[PDB]
Ligand binder design. Structure first.
Ligand code: HEM
Length: 151
């Protein structure tokens, strides 16, 4: 489990993200889609986007970026007790969206990359390690529910 100190590092940089949820959301999804094209195919709404420029110009994509980061933010603030927030997400992503745990690892990588680019001063090695731990916890817990459902 994460220590109190680790959670503080996570929430300190996350407070910076919430200052511009929409901007971060775009960068993260675009990074995810460009680095792992198979993830873009999971979105009927975004399949038509064939270039980074098209992705950046999509208001709909920007809208989803906010939805994603807002859900993640709520989870992170619950620290070591995010059971309630995780249940709905795990269910929909396992049964409706069909998102393998591997894709969650991909988006975790996208999140860390963007945080480094936008907040280097509050995202040094210690903070980076802490965020990695928090995102690993997120994945592990979702994985547990996936195994439960048999996905
Ligand atoms: C940080 C990790 C993620 C969070 C917090 C997150 C959160 C959400 C939320 C809140 C919704 C809308 C409500 C719902 O359907 O449950 C959603 C929808 C969706 N997510 Fe995620 N998601 C994450 C990662 C992913 C990944 C990695 C993929 C695909 C590779 C994905 C694919 C989808 C799809 C396809 C939908 C449905 C979109 C629609 O029909 O409009 N999500 N996600």
């Amino acid at each position: 489990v994460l220590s109190e100190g680790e959670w503080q590092l996570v929430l300190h940089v996350w407070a910076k993200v919430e200052a511009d949820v929409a901007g971060h959301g775009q960068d993260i999804l675009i990074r995810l889609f460009k680095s792992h094209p198979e993830t873009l195919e999971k979105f009927d709404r975004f399949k038509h986007l064939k270039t980074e420029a098209e992705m950046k110009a999509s208001e709909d994509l920007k809208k989803h970026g906010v939805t994603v980061l807002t859900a993640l933010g709520a989870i992170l603030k619950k620290k070591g007790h995010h059971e309630a927030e995780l249940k709905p997400l795990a269910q929909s992503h396992a049964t409706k969206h069909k998102i393998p745990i591997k894709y969650l690892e991909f988006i975790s990588e996208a999140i860390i990359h963007v945080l480094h680019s936008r907040h280097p001063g509050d995202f040094g090695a210690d903070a980076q390690g802490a965020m990695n731990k928090a995102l690993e916890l997120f994945r592990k817990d979702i994985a547990a529910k996936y195994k439960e459902l048999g996905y």
